[PDB]
Amino acid sequence: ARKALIEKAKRTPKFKVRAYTRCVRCGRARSVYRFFGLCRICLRELAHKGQLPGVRKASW
Amino acid sequence: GKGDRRTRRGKIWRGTYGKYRPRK
Amino acid sequence: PRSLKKGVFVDDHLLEKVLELNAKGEKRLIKTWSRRSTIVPEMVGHTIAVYNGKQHVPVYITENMVGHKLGEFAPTRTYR
Amino acid sequence: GNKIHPIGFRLGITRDWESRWYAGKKQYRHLLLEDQRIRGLLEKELYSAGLARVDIERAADNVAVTVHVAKPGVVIGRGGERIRVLREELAKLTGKNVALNVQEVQNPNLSAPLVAQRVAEQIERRFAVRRAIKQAVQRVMESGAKGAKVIVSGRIGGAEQARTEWAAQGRVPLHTLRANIDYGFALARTTYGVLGVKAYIFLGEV
RNA sequence: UGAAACUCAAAGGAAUUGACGGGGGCCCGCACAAGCGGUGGAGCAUGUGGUUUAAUUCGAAGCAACGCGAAGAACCUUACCAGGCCUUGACAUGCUAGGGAACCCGGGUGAAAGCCUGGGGUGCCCCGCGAGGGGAGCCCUAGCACAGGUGCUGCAUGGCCGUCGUCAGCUCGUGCCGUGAGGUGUUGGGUUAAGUCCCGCAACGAGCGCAACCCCCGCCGUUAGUUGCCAGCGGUUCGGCCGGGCACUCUAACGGGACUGCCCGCGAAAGCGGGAGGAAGGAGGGGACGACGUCUGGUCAGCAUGGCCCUUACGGCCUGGGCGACACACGUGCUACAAUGCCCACUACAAAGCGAUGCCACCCGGCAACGGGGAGCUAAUCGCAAAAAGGUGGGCCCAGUUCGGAUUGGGGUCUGCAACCCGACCCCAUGAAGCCGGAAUCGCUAGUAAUCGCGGAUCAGCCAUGCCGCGGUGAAUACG
Ligand SMILES: [K+]
Ligand SMILES: [K+]
Ligand SMILES: [Mg+2]
Ligand SMILES: [Mg+2]
Ligand SMILES: [Mg+2]
Ligand SMILES: [Mg+2]
Ligand SMILES: [Mg+2]
Ligand SMILES: [Mg+2]
Ligand SMILES: [Mg+2]
Ligand SMILES: [Mg+2]
Ligand SMILES: [Mg+2]
Ligand SMILES: [Mg+2]
Ligand SMILES: [Mg+2]
Ligand SMILES: [Mg+2]
Ligand SMILES: [Mg+2]
Ligand SMILES: [Mg+2]
Ligand SMILES: [Mg+2]
Ligand SMILES: [Mg+2]
Ligand SMILES: [Mg+2]
Ligand SMILES: [Mg+2]
Ligand SMILES: [Mg+2]
Ligand SMILES: [Mg+2]
Ligand SMILES: [Mg+2]
Ligand SMILES: [Mg+2]
Ligand SMILES: [Mg+2]
Ligand SMILES: [Mg+2]
Ligand SMILES: [Mg+2]
Ligand SMILES: [Mg+2]
Ligand SMILES: [Mg+2]
Ligand SMILES: [Mg+2]
Ligand SMILES: [Mg+2]
Ligand SMILES: [Mg+2]
Ligand SMILES: [Mg+2]
Ligand SMILES: [Mg+2]
Ligand SMILES: [Mg+2]
Ligand SMILES: [Mg+2]
Ligand SMILES: [Mg+2]
Ligand SMILES: [Mg+2]
Ligand SMILES: [Mg+2]
Ligand SMILES: [Mg+2]
Ligand SMILES: [Mg+2]
Ligand SMILES: [Mg+2]
Ligand SMILES: [Mg+2]
Ligand SMILES: [Mg+2]
Ligand SMILES: [Mg+2]
Ligand SMILES: [Mg+2]
Ligand SMILES: [Zn+2]
Numbered sequence: 001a002r003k004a005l006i007e008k009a010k011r012t013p014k015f016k017v018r019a020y021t022r023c024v025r026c027g028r029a030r031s032v033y034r035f036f037g038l039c040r041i042c043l044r045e046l047a048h049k050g051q052l053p054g055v056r057k058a059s060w
Numbered sequence: 061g062k063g064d065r066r067t068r069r070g071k072i073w074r075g076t077y078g079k080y081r082p083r084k
Numbered sequence: 085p086r087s088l089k090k091g092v093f094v095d096d097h098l099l100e101k102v103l104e105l106n107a108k109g110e111k112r113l114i115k116t117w118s119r120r121s122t123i124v125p126e127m128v129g130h131t132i133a134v135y136n137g138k139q140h141v142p143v144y145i146t147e148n149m150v151g152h153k154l155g156e157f158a159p160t161r162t163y164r
Numbered sequence: 165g166n167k168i169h170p171i172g173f174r175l176g177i178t179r180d181w182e183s184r185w186y187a188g189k190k191q192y193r194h195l196l197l198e199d200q201r202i203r204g205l206l207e208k209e210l211y212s213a214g215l216a217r218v219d220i221e222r223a224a225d226n227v228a229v230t231v232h233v234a235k236p237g238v239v240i241g242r243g244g245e246r247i248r249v250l251r252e253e254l255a256k257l258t259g260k261n262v263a264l265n266v267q268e269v270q271n272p273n274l275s276a277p278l279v280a281q282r283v284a285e286q287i288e289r290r291f292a293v294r295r296a297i298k299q300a301v302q303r304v305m306e307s308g309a310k311g312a313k314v315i316v317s318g319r320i321g322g323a324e325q326a327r328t329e330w331a332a333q334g335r336v337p338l339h340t341l342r343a344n345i346d347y348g349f350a351l352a353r354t355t356y357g358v359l360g361v362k363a364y365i366f367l368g369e370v
Numbered sequence: 371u372g373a374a375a376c377u378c379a380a381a382g383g384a385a386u387u388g389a390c391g392g393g394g395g396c397c398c399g400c401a402c403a404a405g406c407g408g409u410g411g412a413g414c415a416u417g418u419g420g421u422u423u424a425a426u427u428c429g430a431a432g433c434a435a436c437g438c439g440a441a442g443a444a445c446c447u448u449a450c451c452a453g454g455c456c457u458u459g460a461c462a463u464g465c466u467a468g469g470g471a472a473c474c475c476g477g478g479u480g481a482a483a484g485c486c487u488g489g490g491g492u493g494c495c496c497c498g499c500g501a502g503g504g505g506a507g508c509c510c511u512a513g514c515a516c517a518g519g520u521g522c523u524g525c526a527u528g529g530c531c532g533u534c535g536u537c538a539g540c541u542c543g544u545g546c547c548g549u550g551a552g553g554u555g556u557u558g559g560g561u562u563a564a565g566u567c568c569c570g571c572a573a574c575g576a577g578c579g580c581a582a583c584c585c586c587c588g589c590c591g592u593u594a595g596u597u598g599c600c601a602g603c604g605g606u607u608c609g610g611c612c613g614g615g616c617a618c619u620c621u622a623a624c625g626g627g628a629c630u631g632c633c634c635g636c637g638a639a640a641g642c643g644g645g646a647g648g649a650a651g652g653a654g655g656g657g658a659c660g661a662c663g664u665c666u667g668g669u670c671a672g673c674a675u676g677g678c679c680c681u682u683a684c685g686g687c688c689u690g691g692g693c694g695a696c697a698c699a700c701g702u703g704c705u706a707c708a709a710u711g712c713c714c715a716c717u718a719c720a721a722a723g724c725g726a727u728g729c730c731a732c733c734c735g736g737c738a739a740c741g742g743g744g745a746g747c748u749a750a751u752c753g754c755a756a757a758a759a760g761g762u763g764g765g766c767c768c769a770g771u772u773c774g775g776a777u778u779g780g781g782g783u784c785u786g787c788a789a790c791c792c793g794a795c796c797c798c799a800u801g802a803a804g805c806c807g808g809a810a811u812c813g814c815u816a817g818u819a820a821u822c823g824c825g826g827a828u829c830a831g832c833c834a835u836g837c838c839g840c841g842g843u844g845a846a847u848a849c850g
Contacts, residue, residue, distance in 0.1 A: 001672070002449080002520065003461050004686060010460085014482095015787045017830065018446040024197050028672045029448095031441060031828075037193040040441075041530080041672050048172030050181040051203075052196070057172065059658040060586040062835095063414090063705045063775050065796090067713075070775090072758080072823080073705095073835090078738045078796055084756070085796090087782055088789085095788085097481060117453090117481045117689050120445095120788050135481085136791090137691025138424050138452040155790035161695050162423060165531045165668090166660055173659075176584055188748090311577085317528055319676080324526055325666090335577070339659060342583050351528075357676035358528045370583080 001027025088122075095121040102127060115140040119155030134158035170338055170347045170364070178344035185222030195222060198258050202229060205253065213238035216275040216348075227262040229254070234272035273307040277348030280363035283314060284350030287359055293320045297331040304365055311335040311366035322356045336366045344368050 006027050013019040021032045025046075028039035036043055036052070047055050062073035071081035095118035103126055105111045115133035128147050133140035136158040143157045171179055187195050203218050206229075213233040221228035233239055240247045247264060254262045272278045279300050286296040297314045304312035311334030318326025337343050345366045352359040 002685095003518065005448090005460095005520090007460055008446090013446080015445080017786060017788095020447055022447095023672070024193075025200070026672045026674095030439080030672080033441085033827080034829090035189055035192060037197060039672065044530085045673090046200075048169035050171055050175050050179065051183055051200070053181055053183045053185055053187075056175055057585085057658070059584080060656080061705060061708095061712085061774065065775085067775095069712095069758095072756085074795085076739080076795065077756095078740095080738090081756090082738075085780075085782080086789095087784090089783070093788065095481085115481090118788090119690075119790065135453080135690050140453095153790045155690095158790080160691060160791045161426080163695065164422070164697085165529095165533095168659075174584090178583095319527060322676095326527055330662095332577085337578085339579075339581095339661090340583065341659090349529085351674080353674095354676070357526065358674070360528045 001029075092122050092124065093120070094124060097121075098132070099124075102130060105130070113142070116154070119153065119158055121154055123150055123152050123154060125150055136160055167338065170343075170345050173338075174341060174343070174345070176341075178342050182217060183220045183222075185220070201257060202227075202254065205257065206231065206250075209250065210239060214272060214275075214278055214281065216269055216272070216277045225260045227254075227258075227260055228265070229262060230265040230267060232267045232269060234269045234275065234278060236266050236268040239266045271307050273303045274309060274346070274365055274367065275348070276346035276363035276365045277350070278363075279304055279312075279314070279365070280348040280350030280361045282350075283316070283363070284352045284359075284361040287316070287352045287361070288354060293329050294331070297329055300363075301331045301333055305333045309334065309365050309367055311364075313364040315360075315362040315364075317352075317358070317360035319354075319357050319359060322354075332364070334366065336364050338364075340369075342369050 001022075006022060008020060008022050008029075020029065021034070021037065022029045023032050023039035023042050024037040025042040026039055028041065031040045032038065033040070033043060038046070043052070046052050061067075062069050064070040065074060065076075066080055068081055071077060077083050095116075097118050098114055098116050098121065102114065105114070106126060110129060113131055113133055115135070117135045119134050119136075123145055127145045128150060130145055132143050132145060132154060134143055134154045134157060135141075137160055141158045143154070149157075175181065183196075183199055185195060185199075199220050199222075202220065206218055207215060210231060210233065213231075213235050215231060215233050217232040219228075219230040219232070221230075231239060238246075239250075241249070247266065251262070251264045254264065269275050269278070283296050283300050287293065293316055297316060300314050301312050311332070313330075313332030313336045315331075316329045318328055320327050320329060336345065338345065343366060345364055347365075348363040350361040350363070352361060
């Protein structure tokens with residue numbers, strides 16, 4: 001997550017396409033979820049803390 | 061077989077539609 | 085099985101830079117980076133230098149290739 | 165590299181969340197980022213007070229932030245000056261008229277996060293790791309608790325060979341659900357590198 | 371009988387804990403055997419090695435790297451390369467001024483980025499009648515502290531993960547034994563899936579693990595009826611449509627249920643075999659959960675981090691290219707080679723999920739992909755949605771064939787600024803290899819395997835035949 005690249009937040013995409021997501025917590029671009037704006041790693045982390053409301057450990 | 065796009069199964073497998081499998 | 089739709093795309097970069105170079109006759113070379121642009125009629129007879137990624141390549145565009153793209157003539161990779 | 169977070173494992177029972185607010189696929193991600201940003205300034209500030217937890221309830225532009233601490237006085241300030249400045253710093257970050265309760269801890273030796281922080285500090289102050297550990301485990305064990313356990317990472321005393329120090333007393337069944345084991349992780353920046361402290365405190369069951 | 375020079379920091383003895391033998395006893399696991407279906411051969415998809423390249427960014431390396439990080443490479447992503455450009459900087463906090471600055475808008479050039487600019491405008495403070503002066507704020511320019519660095523080290527680290535392995539087992543306290551390392555306990559006999567429980571015992575207990583507490587599935591009940599229904603009845607555009615009713619089905623909260631309790635047989639016990647009643651019987655089925663520790667395992671490229679190294683460049687911006695090269699080699703898969711089959715009709719029967727600038731009913735246009743119009747749903751209420759395998763009828767008649775759908779030529783449709791490199795989809799034409807696969811090798815013990823389709827994450831679109839789940843039909847075999 002190069003600071004220079006976390007410029008993604010930069011609305012101005014010039015072309016709506018070029019706009020992509022990134023972890024809002026680690027900057028991770030490679031596996032970010034929409035409903036959390038978090039990557040699979042950061043997501044797993046906070047979920048463990050209990051800081052992700054309603055999110056529990058699914059078993060079945 | 062599922063690889064024949066010009067057949068029923070072809071379409072279904074590829075999850076598409078067309079002459080060989082129109083939407084009812 | 086090729087296809088775009090309606091609006092034979094062409095970067096105006098060179099278009100309005102060639103359709104103009106028609107008025108005062110022709111010219112000699114037009115180096116571009118837009119290999120995306122579709123070749124069209126009023127290009128025939130010209131010579132466009134297309135960037136392959138390392139260099140600009142000379143391309144005498146002729147009738148027989150009026151529908152193709154510019155990149156199609158500037159091969160990207162170098163093999164054996 | 166095994167064993168799950170003892171809390172995330174116990175969210176169903178013996179353990180509640182640190183954020184209680186419903187939301188939809190359109191808001192959730194935001195009220196989340198913010199909800200975090202809060203813990204951001206907070207934990208970077210209220211450090212000294214010794215913040216053990218930050219619950220966050222929401223309703224609708226309403227924020228029931230409840231900073232838990234051992235020294236509720238560092239929160240307040242002179243007469244009530246801090247819980248004024250900060251309480252304003254919050255609503256500044258997110259214009260949402262935010263409350264900001266403050267609670268004291270009935271024994272900071274049973275706040276796993278704190279115990280971790282404590283030990284984590286002694287480490288930067290260049291204490292003898294094993295001592296700190298044994299001690300901590302003691303404090304906790306003394307002031308109640310049916311079991312406790314502390315873990316420090318490696319590079320103990322600036323050693324090139326990273327290690328891992330133990331120490332623990334009484335029960336600490338990570339496998340049993342209805343255990344109610346508080347847990348806390350404290351970092352530990354240093355002249356030579358990072359260390360990691362983990363605190364476990366077992367109290368009651370059923 | 372018996373040396374010396376020279377050379378070494380050991381050579382040795384007994385005992386301890388381990389690890390190990392082609393030592394012994396005892397026992398377990400899809401470990402073998404039994405059995406069912408594959409892979410290895412083909413075509414293609416995908417990852418990799420190797421070559422190639424301006425670059426083909428980096429990592430992962432027997433098991434435990436190779437549809438792995440990537441749950442989405444056309445630009446973006448992107449870390450690589452070529453070229454055109456920036457320099458307190460795309461981001462933070464600050465400082466000394468030479469000065470004008472909040473901001474708004476047009477042009478020159480250009481691939482863009484930039485570099486030049488040409489203007490429209492002056493609020494906020496304390497002054498001053500005013501002209502105007504000095505200051506906040508913000509923006510520029512010139513030096514400065516400093517930012518920034520997928521730049522090295524995973525053998526300096528945290529955190530998280532993998533692995534032996536859900537395999538049991540690993541320990542402590544006090545006592546006892548031994549000069550001591552240590553031993554006893556934890557060994558032994560019976561028994562368990564289990565260091566599970568029993569019995570015995572110089573030990574008596576305890577901790578981390580087993581187990582149990584949590585989730586799903588199976589039977590029943592109690593509140594609770596915008597989804598069930600003539601169950602029972604009255605209406606019928608015979609659509610559970612309307613009235614109507616919660617019985618039933620469901621939906622989802624809370625409880626009941628199983629305890630080897632009962633009977634018989636064997637034990638000394640724990641338990642073992644068997645029988646009843648029960649939806650379920652002796653851990654009912656599946657999951658979450660993986661001890662002290664091992665592999666100087668993996669990751670400095672998620673993030674954090676000590677130390678090194680670059681700081682008009684190892685930072686930053688673009689436009690284009692590359693990550694998509696190919697003589698060739700391997701892994702994982704997909705589609706097949708057909709008649710227990712393929713094709714076209716007609717008709718049945720699911721479960722989980724997802725959807726307000728998103729699912730998209732229905733209608734019209736088009737062979738179609740899709741266009742145009744348009745109802746409905748904040749969704750047990752509308753849409754995705756067809757279920758396919760099946761069942762019924764019909765065709766093909768053993769052929770590289772109505773098997774198979776690779777490759778290639780056309781003509782189109784979508785997404786997108788843009789599909790040459792390098793998208794999916796549709797239609798016409800083309801119609802490859804392939805006749806069941808050498809040596810070798812993988813999976814699975816039952817709703818499992820094998821087969822059939824369906825959804826979701828990522829996501830504009832997609833290179834998904836990959837992952838992660840869902841339900842239909844449903845075997846064989848285990849002497850040992
Ligand atoms: K290591
Ligand atoms: K072929
Ligand atoms: Mg960074
Ligand atoms: Mg994108
Ligand atoms: Mg992304
Ligand atoms: Mg066919
Ligand atoms: Mg010697
Ligand atoms: Mg000896
Ligand atoms: Mg020995
Ligand atoms: Mg077995
Ligand atoms: Mg096997
Ligand atoms: Mg066998
Ligand atoms: Mg093969
Ligand atoms: Mg590689
Ligand atoms: Mg590396
Ligand atoms: Mg690219
Ligand atoms: Mg221009
Ligand atoms: Mg390592
Ligand atoms: Mg590590
Ligand atoms: Mg490595
Ligand atoms: Mg077990
Ligand atoms: Mg002892
Ligand atoms: Mg002795
Ligand atoms: Mg003694
Ligand atoms: Mg002992
Ligand atoms: Mg032992
Ligand atoms: Mg022993
Ligand atoms: Mg023994
Ligand atoms: Mg036990
Ligand atoms: Mg045993
Ligand atoms: Mg004993
Ligand atoms: Mg290593
Ligand atoms: Mg290795
Ligand atoms: Mg580092
Ligand atoms: Mg690749
Ligand atoms: Mg080659
Ligand atoms: Mg495949
Ligand atoms: Mg039509
Ligand atoms: Mg393309
Ligand atoms: Mg042949
Ligand atoms: Mg044949
Ligand atoms: Mg088995
Ligand atoms: Mg699918
Ligand atoms: Mg998609
Ligand atoms: Mg492709
Ligand atoms: Mg698919
Ligand atoms: Zn993340």
